[PDB]
């Protein structure tokens, strides 16, 4: 689990009337070091609504831990699109994957991502996935 007093501090600072929206719960979870998906958000909303007291926030953070995350599963997801098995993907290829499939990045998100974490037209997706899991 995340760091409990940080979880409490961030919730209390974001809360209004002792509650935070699931939208804010998503942000705080990320700040706490987790990677909730939008599917996690929708799943939780259908289960517990979109306005969380601290107990329900703790539970949401719980469902967002994804201990099953593994570098090999991520690396091989990108490898699938490495048609010619180069061991890298171009900016185009990375962009097309990340903005078309799954829970697609917005151009805002992708442009920020590319600025910091991309380095060329030969993105080593193994090392990129390592960085993302860090």
């Amino acid at each position: 689990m995340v760091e409990a007093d940080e979880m409490y501090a961030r919730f209390n600072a974001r809360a209004s009337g002792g509650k935070v929206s699931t939208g804010d719960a998503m942000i705080l979870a990320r700040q706490l070091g987790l990677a909730p998906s939008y599917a996690d958000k929708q799943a939780f909303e259908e289960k517990s609504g979109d306005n969380l007291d601290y107990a329900s926030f703790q539970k949401f953070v719980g469902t967002s831990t994804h201990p099953e995350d593994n570098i090999e599963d991520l690396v091989e997801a990108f490898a699938y699109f490495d048609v010619s098995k180069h061991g890298y993907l171009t900016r185009k290829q990375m962009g097309n994957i990340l903005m078309t499939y799954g829970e697609p990045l917005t151009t805002e998100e992708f442009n920020a991502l590319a600025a910091e974490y991309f380095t060329s037209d030969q993105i080593d997706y193994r090392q990129f996935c390592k960085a993302m899991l860090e």
Partner: peptide, 30 residues
């Protein structure tokens, strides 16, 4: 069967962009 892991990659991307104020509240999945 790769899509669930693309989503995990995208979730971890968003985790690292949290201070960038760029991520939407909702995303239309594909």
């Amino acid at each position: 069967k790769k899509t669930p892991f693309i989503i995990r990659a995208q979730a971890h991307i968003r985790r690292h962009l949290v201070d960038n104020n760029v991520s939407p509240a909702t995303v239309q999945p594909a």
